[PDB]
Each structure stands twice: as C-alpha cells, then as structure tokens.
Amino acid sequence: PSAQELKEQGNRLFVGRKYPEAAACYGRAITRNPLVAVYYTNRALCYLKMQQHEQALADCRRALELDGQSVKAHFFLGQCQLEMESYDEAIANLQRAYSLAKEQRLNFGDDIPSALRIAKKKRWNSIEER
C-alpha cells in the first residue's frame, strides 16, 4: 500500500471517530514517506481528540521542520500549547496561523479569530496571580 493510499484509509477512520485506528494509519504512511508534513498534522489531530497534548506537540514540531508555512501545523501547535497552559506561545502560533491563512487566501469562516479570542481570555484567567 502507498503512503497516499494509507493516508486516505486513515482519513476515513478519522471521519468515523475511530481515532486510535486512524492514527495507526498515519504512522504507517509516515514510515513509507516521512517527508510529507500533512501526515504529521493529521496524526497530531488524532492525538488532540484522544486528549494527548504531548504527542500531538511532537508531530506539530515535525510538520514545521518540513513545512514552515503550514496553517494547520501552527494552529494545532497553538492549541496544544493552550492545553498545556503555555499561553504566550499559543497566541503567537495562532496569530502566525492567522497571518498565513490570510496570505494563502484560505477561508475557515470565523475559526481562527474564535480560537484567538478564547486563548486571550484563558490567559487572563491565569494572571490572577500577584
């Protein structure tokens, strides 16, 4: 089976909400061709749904080594940072995601500004310390 064929099987599994099984497909796809960034971002998303902030972070990192202009790598990375309470980085990555999508003329509705607005609020709820 090819790397592309394996990604597609994994995507079908993702839509079916069978996340662990979908991640296994992405890994196998990575094995046959480890130099395609999407396979890393997809699997990061499986990890995010499986509530594993740490492993998803690593796949984002790999994705950005290959594709530094990736909106979803920057986006999911911010989201991992938000769930690990690294607020300042997360807002950076989300805003960097936000700049890229504008340049590339991508259209995700109001998805990025929402995420940005939530993170800015979460941050303030943390600064309650003096």
Partner: protein, 91 residues
C-alpha cells in the same frame, strides 16, 4: 458497468483541470504537470474504445492511473501550502 466506468472517466477529466488550475501555479513543475495530462488522456482514450472489456481489464487501467497520480499528488502536499469548525479536519 456504467456506474464504475463513470467514476474513472470523471476522475480523469477533473484531474486534468486541477493540475492546469491557476491556483496550483508554482506548486507543480511543467514536467509533472504534463505527465498527468498524458496519462489522463490515455485512460480516457482507452475507455472510448474498450467498451466490451471485463472487470479485471478495467481494474488494471485504474491501478495504473493512480500509480502515476498519487506520487504527483504527494508532491503537491510537499509544496508551500501544503495543500489544505472547518479547520478541525484531516487533510
């Protein structure tokens, strides 16, 4: 069979329109851009003549066409995009 035959022919025509799209400019070299056009035009042509052929014969043409396209597909991902709650979906 017309229903299976339809997916192959439509795949072929659409794939051609895709690689020639102004959006994918600078995401594919004209050499790879040209070999998709070729194999699509070849598969379409085959369907035009072989309307008596059998399932295995159809299947062979199908496997062949995706053996050229998938690699080029994979390189589209490897460009500067790569190739993308809507944002919360696999690509």
């Amino acid at each position: 069979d017309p229903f299976t035959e339809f997916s192959l022919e439509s795949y072929a025509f659409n794939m051609k329109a895709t690689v020639e799209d102004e959006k994918l400019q600078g995401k594919i070299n004209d050499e790879d851009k040209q070999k998709i056009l070729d194999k699509c035009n070849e598969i379409i042509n085959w369907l035009d003549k072989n309307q008596t052929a059998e399932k295995e014969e159809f299947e062979h043409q199908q496997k062949e066409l995706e053996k050229v396209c998938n690699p080029i597909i994979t390189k589209l991902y490897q460009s500067a995009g790569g190739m993308p709650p809507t944002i919360e979906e696999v690509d």
